[PDB]
Amino acid sequence: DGVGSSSGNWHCDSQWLGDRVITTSTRTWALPTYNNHLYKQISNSTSGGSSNDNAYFGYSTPWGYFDFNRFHCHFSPRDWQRLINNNWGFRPKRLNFKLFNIQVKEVTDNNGVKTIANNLTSTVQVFTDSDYQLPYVLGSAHEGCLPPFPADVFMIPQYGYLTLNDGSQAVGRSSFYCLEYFPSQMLRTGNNFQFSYEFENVPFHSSYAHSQSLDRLMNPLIDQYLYYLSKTINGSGQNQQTLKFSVAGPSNMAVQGRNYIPGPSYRQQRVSTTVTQNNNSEFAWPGASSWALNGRNSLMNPGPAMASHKEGEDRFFPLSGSLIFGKQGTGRDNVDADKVMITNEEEIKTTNPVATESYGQVATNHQSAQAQAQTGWVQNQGILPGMVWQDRDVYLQGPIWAKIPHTDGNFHPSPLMGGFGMKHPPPQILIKNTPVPADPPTAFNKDKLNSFITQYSTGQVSVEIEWELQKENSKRWNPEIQYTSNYYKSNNVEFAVNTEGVYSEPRPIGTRYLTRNL
Amino acid sequence: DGVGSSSGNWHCDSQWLGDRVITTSTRTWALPTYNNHLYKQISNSTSGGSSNDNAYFGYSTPWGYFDFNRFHCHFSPRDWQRLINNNWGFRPKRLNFKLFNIQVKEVTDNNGVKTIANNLTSTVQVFTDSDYQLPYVLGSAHEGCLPPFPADVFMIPQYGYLTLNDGSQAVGRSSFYCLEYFPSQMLRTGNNFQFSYEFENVPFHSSYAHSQSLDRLMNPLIDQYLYYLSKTINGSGQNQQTLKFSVAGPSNMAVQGRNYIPGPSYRQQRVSTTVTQNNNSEFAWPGASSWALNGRNSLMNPGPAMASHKEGEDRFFPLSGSLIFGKQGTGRDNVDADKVMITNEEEIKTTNPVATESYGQVATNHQSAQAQAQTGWVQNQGILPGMVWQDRDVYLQGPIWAKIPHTDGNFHPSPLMGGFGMKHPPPQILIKNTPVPADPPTAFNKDKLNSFITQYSTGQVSVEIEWELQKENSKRWNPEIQYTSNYYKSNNVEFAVNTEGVYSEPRPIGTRYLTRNL
Amino acid sequence: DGVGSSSGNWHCDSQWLGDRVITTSTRTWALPTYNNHLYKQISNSTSGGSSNDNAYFGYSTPWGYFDFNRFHCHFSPRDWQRLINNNWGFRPKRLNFKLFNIQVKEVTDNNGVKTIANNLTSTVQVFTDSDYQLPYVLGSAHEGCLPPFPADVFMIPQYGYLTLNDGSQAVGRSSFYCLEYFPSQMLRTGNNFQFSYEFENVPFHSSYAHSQSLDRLMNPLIDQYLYYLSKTINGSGQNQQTLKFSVAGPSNMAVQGRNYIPGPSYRQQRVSTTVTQNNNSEFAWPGASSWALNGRNSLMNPGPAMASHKEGEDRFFPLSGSLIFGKQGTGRDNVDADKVMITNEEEIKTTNPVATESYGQVATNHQSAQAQAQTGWVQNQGILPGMVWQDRDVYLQGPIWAKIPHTDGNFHPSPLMGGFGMKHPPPQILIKNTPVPADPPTAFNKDKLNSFITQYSTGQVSVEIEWELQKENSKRWNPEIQYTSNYYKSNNVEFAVNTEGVYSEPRPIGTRYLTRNL
Ligand SMILES: OC[C@H]1O[C@@H](O)[C@H](O)[C@@H](O)[C@H]1O
Ligand SMILES: OC[C@H]1O[C@@H](O)[C@H](O)[C@@H](O)[C@H]1O
Ligand SMILES: OC[C@H]1O[C@@H](O)[C@H](O)[C@@H](O)[C@H]1O
């Protein structure tokens, strides 16, 4: 419309209907010029680091993008609690996005003091990649998200992508993308932008833990009608061999026949938070579970979902097998365990094998009168018919969704870091403020113009997501575990602002509190 | 209605339509009072046995439940034969249940002689758990089923369940259930009960065996157009290396290219019924294939479906890899092989690996001029794209269905003991005769009344199941294997009553007789 | 609309209809940035002062709010006089609020000389808390109100709130509020804001004084038919005891029977404005009437409404029992009595006990032949059936309304400082100018942006209140006390501007001039 009118309003409310929640968040953003208006080839050679596992080839762009893909973007800690205490499941349904109240500003510097003024005629240009024609960066869990606390003003992250490489070099199959080669909407002060999105059908996340374990499904009062082999020798001596069979029953539960077995396993190395119990050596990379692709070793960071420890073993965690979040103000490199938050998958110990344990034992030979029976430990176990498992839990700090890679086949394409896998996830919103040249020469030159006016833009983003809820039907008599605040005398309220104005999130909050039968 | 009228009739017929069978069974039951009208916390501590694998925590209830979940409940041996000889497949469709002609009886004992009288005003109360809000006990294969022989009167089994535990202790996530906290129908003599159930869509059980093996699918008369590496050395000597390639053809079938491979394997230890061929040692538990869950080892009793032995090896069976049924009158503990019936999965040797064999071999290294080629045995193999398998066979003595555990994911949720997996299986029917207090004090006391009239109830159950049939279309010229009775001079007719009045089932009858092409 | 159009007009008129008055006020405001765009935890620890009575915990916000909650906002001194001379009562009815002609301005400073320019694209955001979901700050009588004189330009006060504390620490029950978590309307130059409000039904304020006292309601000419005990002894001597009864009549009025008694009392310490008559000691805090809450002592500042002094005792006032207003230009701390204005409740001496007196006397024992009759002084008296009282008077300088605390119970929830109590008072209007970032880095950083453009906003506020009037019906023959200006030779007109341009209010003006029968 015009310079004097606001093109949108601040909308942060969240409304709770019966089966649905609608969260709306508004933030203030700032967009710098990136790469001096250039596309740039980037590689580990451009970075200077040399390792085959770390080699890459790609491009950085002048563009930037919006990321609302963490839950704390859409939920207050109080709202998150209302979700996880009262519901068996939730999934996203619809999405609404807005850009409004856009301000482009010119920066003028002369002797070292800078002046900021409005440039009213400058434009910022925006588009969504709806056909998923760009490398999709939102699936990897990166920073640059809308801040969890509504009063914080955030910088928009720079867009870049990777393609095929051999070492630092490219190959003919490597592809280059100019984002100017897409249609984008141009917006001056007084123009606004919006689009809507429908989440494709996904299963509900399971916000519950099981109140039963897969190995105790039976009636403790009744015998099975099935027999197992109890004795193979009549006693001590020579040539003592029998086949004795017993009924499986309450007295021996481990031996009963069962219809279903725990899910797959890929074993992790066990690390103690008590430090004297760890080996004295550097095992971090060497002792790590990894997978190889085209000669590169990728550490298996969030591998298959597994129980992080056995009972009472809480000090133990898998080496890379769990999500690790930083506390507010935590540095980038070589930080103590105190400054990081290690989440645990403990609730899924009912259907899932422990991450640091073998799956089980198998027979490795044929016994005979000559040969004793030999077993071996199953370190990794793929899917078997009759396996049953839970996915990884969801966190208020964690990612909401991921893009399922477009491929001939996949199995159970739930994101291993967590959340909802989608062939067509919420599209990428790419934003850039358009280059404004400085004064060109007065005689013609064919070289592209490398001299521009220093600018940046600010504005507001609204994101609205509808969430479908799955209510708890339970007949459980005794009360249940809920997420609570503790009452006792803190210096600071948790999930509140600091005395210096800093918002922090004291601990990770998982989704799984309510219980179901297994 | 009233004391003098029958509230139902005896209905045992089974009617065979073209595509469907309807089996109806009627039995007479007796219901005791369980637990002295109490709910009781039970654990391995209450049982006194201590092993971490066998530890449990749960509750026993005053309630009891009906189990018709074995096939011999619904099929006579003659009906079972008509099913398995004439049909390629079957599945359950509808279910109808009735309770009628209910009689509550008071037991009076004074000096040690007891008198039984009718209590006409007493009531028995019944409900089905339709929302699956209770721990589901019918999936584990327990005793307490309707007896296979219609003239036998059976005792109703006591209901109980398990929940989470650490050792014998519970955890806050453990859940307690009062069955009085459900609505239930009360029934006096003259009241009857019924409900209907729809089986959710399940695949047909495969009542056939394959007439082809997965490794012979080819035309024996024709060569492939594909080549394999036949020779790696030109001959004996030094520096003799070649690559020689041959056509795969009828002469060498093992090396041909194939589109599909056999199903997954988890290896079992091999045990001989000839006893002198077994090792002299106790390998039963130690040499057993197991899986671990939260620190407990559960023996893998009916693991993935696998051929129980190779050809001519019938004396061999997997250590726990097969269902083991007892003969009539067989004791509970340490019984000889003669008194038990070991079933075999032999028919599936066409698509499935043998339970006691390795899946195959893989390369463990890179060969080179320095290093010879090394292989290793694959003891367990998870699912691979292109695998093809058969499920475990169904038995007249075996379970019909199971409840699929409610979870984020599962694969091929066919019950490993056998039958039809269902998210919503036939619901549990829970029955209890209501407590009738003895004479209370004449001055008020707040304690709950612990003194009751000794009672029990009897009545009849009808169960009606419709089964959908899949007829055989085969073009096979030669006659086929059928299930038969042998003609020769027994002292007793098989599947008949004893001279003392005892009904026995002489052998397990599987489903797989007719054949199909693979 | 646009940059060149005014979005509202100046409206200050007040129109007098028969039963209603409509006051409209327009002011010019200025809004700074508060807290550097931060929320900040604040406590007596952050302030450094330590006393348990003064301990607090809370938050300061970047937001600010409008306060029109004093009468001089809505009434000129002439209008106030027209109200209080002609009417028995008044109450508020409707409310209309407007924000318009909004101007955001950028402040640029380099070498220490600052330049102010218009920022045309900046926005200010406004919302009302209509659901009363925020801590309500307008009830406490704070500064920051619209100035009484229309030509003064006022600064908008900063919003902040308190929550639960133990000492300077918080508790788990303490709650934090982000105001960005509400929907708010954004407004650029050319946008305006308005909303309407309905006062919920409140009683009229009593703008009258009683022309009778509660202890003289009788006919002075007539006797009562009731008797009192006049004599207990026949005379001087031993064993002189009688019961003598007399008629209560005009000669002895104190002893007559009465249907109604004066209202409740909580006694205050008496302080003289003649200073030599006060004790020589510091009794201010020590000799003060207080109430205790959770271990803290809160001085009872405007306690129950009571007559401030007896007749002719005008020099006396309760220690904290009355509202104390400052004269124009009066300092914050340790100011002489000359610079402050002490109001008096004198008019209510008819129905209300004096603040500095005991309520009365009660019997403390049983008299007998052995024991003389003993009485004791009633220092505080709660409500009794048959009590009758007046509320505190209203002042042109005083507060209009208060929010009744949301609670299970309350009694006579009239605000003790004065005015109209409401469960849903006029809502809080919260205003903030939105942060405009300075130029962000050209490489992405995840830290929130702490660098902003210095801004402030100005504009106009209109407030329109309809007041319902209660006209005087009186039959009084003699003329009545009115509020007047004195005619005699001042250097300055009262309620006028200074010679230096300063507006002052010379004295407090109460509401109670006209009289009624009691
Ligand atoms: O040699 C490959 C390297 O890979 C890196 O990811 C790791 O941090 C190094 O310690 C080393 O393992
Ligand atoms: O040590 C665990 C035990 O588990 C039982 O199920 C088994 O019968 C024992 O022989 C032993 O293996
Ligand atoms: O000891 C509590 C204190 O409370 C304050 O409000 C007062 O000004 C002090 O003089 C003292 O009474």
PDB file of C-alpha atoms in Angstrom, chain B residues 7 57 69 118 231 254 262 316 366 398 468 490 493:
ATOM      1  CA  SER B   7     -32.070 -68.036  28.380  1.00  0.00           C
ATOM      2  CA  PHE B  57       5.563 -56.645  39.107  1.00  0.00           C
ATOM      3  CA  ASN B  69      -8.148 -68.085  21.067  1.00  0.00           C
ATOM      4  CA  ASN B 118     -29.017 -72.131  44.457  1.00  0.00           C
ATOM      5  CA  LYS B 231      38.039 -68.552 -13.298  1.00  0.00           C
ATOM      6  CA  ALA B 254      23.846 -72.094  -8.095  1.00  0.00           C
ATOM      7  CA  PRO B 262      15.211 -65.919   1.049  1.00  0.00           C
ATOM      8  CA  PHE B 316      16.958 -82.163  14.309  1.00  0.00           C
ATOM      9  CA  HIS B 366      39.715 -56.893   0.128  1.00  0.00           C
ATOM     10  CA  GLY B 398      -2.317 -73.258  18.273  1.00  0.00           C
ATOM     11  CA  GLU B 468     -13.590 -66.532   4.876  1.00  0.00           C
ATOM     12  CA  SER B 490      -5.522 -98.911  16.756  1.00  0.00           C
ATOM     13  CA  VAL B 493      -9.681 -94.095  17.562  1.00  0.00           C
TER      14      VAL B 493
END
